[PDB]
Amino acid sequence: ALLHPRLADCRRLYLRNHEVYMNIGAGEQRVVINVDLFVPLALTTPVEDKLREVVDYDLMKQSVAQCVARGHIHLQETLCDAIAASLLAHDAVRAVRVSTEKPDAYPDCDAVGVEVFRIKD
Amino acid sequence: ALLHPRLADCRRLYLRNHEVYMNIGAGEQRVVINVDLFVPLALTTPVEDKLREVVDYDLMKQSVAQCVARGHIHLQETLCDAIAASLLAHDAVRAVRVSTEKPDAYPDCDAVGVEVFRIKD
Amino acid sequence: ALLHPRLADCRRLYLRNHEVYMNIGAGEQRVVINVDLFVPLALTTPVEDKLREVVDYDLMKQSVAQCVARGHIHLQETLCDAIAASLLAHDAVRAVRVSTEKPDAYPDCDAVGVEVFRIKD
Amino acid sequence: ALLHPRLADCRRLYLRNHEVYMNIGAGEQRVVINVDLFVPLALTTPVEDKLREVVDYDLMKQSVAQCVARGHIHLQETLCDAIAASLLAHDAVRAVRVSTEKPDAYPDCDAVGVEVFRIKD
Numbered sequence: 001a002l003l004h005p006r007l008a009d010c011r012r013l014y015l016r017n018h019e020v021y022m023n024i025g026a027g028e029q030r031v032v033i034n035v036d037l038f039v040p041l042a043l044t045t046p047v048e049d050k051l052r053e054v055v056d057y058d059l060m061k062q063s064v065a066q067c068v069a070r071g072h073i074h075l076q077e078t079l080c081d082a083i084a085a086s087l088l089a090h091d092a093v094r095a096v097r098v099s100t101e102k103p104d105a106y107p108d109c110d111a112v113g114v115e116v117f118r119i120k121d
Numbered sequence: 122a123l124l125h126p127r128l129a130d131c132r133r134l135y136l137r138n139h140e141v142y143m144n145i146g147a148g149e150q151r152v153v154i155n156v157d158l159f160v161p162l163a164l165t166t167p168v169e170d171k172l173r174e175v176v177d178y179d180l181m182k183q184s185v186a187q188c189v190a191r192g193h194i195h196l197q198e199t200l201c202d203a204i205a206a207s208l209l210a211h212d213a214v215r216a217v218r219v220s221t222e223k224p225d226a227y228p229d230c231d232a233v234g235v236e237v238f239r240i241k242d
Numbered sequence: 243a244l245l246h247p248r249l250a251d252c253r254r255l256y257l258r259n260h261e262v263y264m265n266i267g268a269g270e271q272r273v274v275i276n277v278d279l280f281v282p283l284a285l286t287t288p289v290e291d292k293l294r295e296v297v298d299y300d301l302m303k304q305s306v307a308q309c310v311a312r313g314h315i316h317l318q319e320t321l322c323d324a325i326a327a328s329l330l331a332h333d334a335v336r337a338v339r340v341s342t343e344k345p346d347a348y349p350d351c352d353a354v355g356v357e358v359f360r361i362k363d
Numbered sequence: 364a365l366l367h368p369r370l371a372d373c374r375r376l377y378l379r380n381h382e383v384y385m386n387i388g389a390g391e392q393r394v395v396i397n398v399d400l401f402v403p404l405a406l407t408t409p410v411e412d413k414l415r416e417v418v419d420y421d422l423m424k425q426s427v428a429q430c431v432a433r434g435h436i437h438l439q440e441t442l443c444d445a446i447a448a449s450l451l452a453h454d455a456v457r458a459v460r461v462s463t464e465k466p467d468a469y470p471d472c473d474a475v476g477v478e479v480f481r482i483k484d
């Protein structure tokens with residue numbers, strides 16, 4: 001992904017397998033979320049080892065929490081697209097990849113999920 | 122994959138590690154199947170959180186079941202290619218990736234498998 | 243990988259985590275090998291579900307066995323390169339990816355390994 | 364990655380899940396590090412099975428140890444960028460991918476991390 005020409009000047013921040021329990025469905029279900037945020041090196045290269053010099057990666061879990069807390073989600077696309085739109089709404093974000101999946105959708109499958117990858121023009 | 126130019130306007134629906142037991146071989150054997158379906162955002166962006174607004178991802182498991190139920194499969198290519206052809210036969214599908222594998226083909230390997238990735242022109 | 247332009251008309255045959263025990267080192271050690279073979283669809287699309295219609299994927303494990311059986315291997319590159327050269331030496335092979343790794347090289351790492359990816363011109 | 368045009372003439376050396384314990388934070392924490400080093404085939408193709416013919420892959424763990432041993436690291440970017448700069452500082456290295464992650468950053472996530480991928484011009 002960091003080989004893509006629009007992303008070659010970026011670092012990747014990533015959140016792996018963030019689980020939440022929520023009401024979702026077209027009791028609560030487990031949903032597993034993965035996020036990749038692409039932020040420019042020129043905006044996120046610390047030279048004083050200070051948090052203010054980078055994009056705080058706590059924004060990924062915060063954005064998922066905000067989206068899940070809105071309630072009333074039926075489709076995985078609704079949640080996935082909302083997390084991606086939230087995370088794109090930041091000046092220092094160039095691109096985002098978000099997947100959601102339901103490990104318990106089917107007894108004979110590990111998961112079924114939805115993924116988007118959005119890059120700013 | 123969603124960086125590929127023909128897929129940049131798509132979301133990815135995915136089915137991870139769908140296991141089936143079937144007669145296959147050039148008793149039943151376990152076969153593990155993975156599917157990625159690429160569907161255009163323009164056709165699958167819900168604005169009312171309704172299932173009719175998207176491509177129902179149950180189509181992946183349904184298509185595998187239909188193919189496995191035909192019986193008389195000897196080669197992994199026969200099954201893999203049939204699942205891919207079935208899933209391409211939908212107006213809102215742009216591309217599909219399908220892999221099949223046999224975890225028990227060899228005692229000293231985790232799996233041997235076959236994968237195809239087909240994109241509509 | 244099947245999005246690469248030279249590989250778009252290929253299927254991928256794969257062998258996941260083939261373990262062998264052998265003398266290797268610059269008692270026996272465990273080495274884990276992964277192989278991807280890219281073969282043209284035009285040469286490997288069965289229409290009669292017969293093995294003669296495809297490239298038999300047993301060739302991957304056979305080639306690893308032949309290379310390991312030669313003995314006297316010190317470097318991972320020597321083994322990896324030999325497996326790749328063996329598997330390229332077939333008319334219906336367009337490309338091969340081979341990795342070798344040593345899970346026990348270091349107590350505080352899962353593995354250290356070497357990978358090559360060779361495509362015929 | 365070995366399909367990328369600048370890397371097509373390279374092999375990949377890789378270190379998977381190197382764990383360290385260190386003080387890091389914007390007691391010690393566990394940090395998991397992954398490294399991919401791209402080195403030209405023309406510089407690393409052994410024909411006599413001798414270590415002097417290749418880039419010794421012990422350099423990856425050595426460089427991580429040197430960086431961790433400097434102490435006083437607050438941000439993951441500081442560590443990740445330092446490992447990448449160290450490993451690029453070798454004539455036979457064409458590119459490097461380095462990720463760091465903290466498995467224990469959040470109770471409901473497997474990890475949060477940072478990755479860079481640097482290629483020499």
Ligand SMILES: Nc1nc2[nH]cnc2c(=O)[nH]1
Pocket residue numbers: 025026074075076077134175176177178179
């Ligand atoms: N695409 C899609 N299909 C479904 N089928 C059942 N639930 C869903 C969902 O959330 N999204």
Ligand SMILES: Nc1nc2[nH]cnc2c(=O)[nH]1
Pocket residue numbers: 146147195196197198255296297298299300
């Ligand atoms: N390519 C291929 N080789 C095999 N060798 C044994 N079974 C098979 C199969 O299903 N496909």
Ligand SMILES: Nc1nc2[nH]cnc2c(=O)[nH]1
Pocket residue numbers: 267268316317318319376417418419420421
């Ligand atoms: N590149 C490389 N470095 C090593 N250092 C120790 N063993 C090896 C090996 O097999 N290959």
Ligand SMILES: Nc1nc2[nH]cnc2c(=O)[nH]1
Pocket residue numbers: 013054055056057058388389437438439440
């Ligand atoms: N990007 C980034 N955000 C953080 N938030 C808390 N620690 C860190 C860190 O090391 N890097």
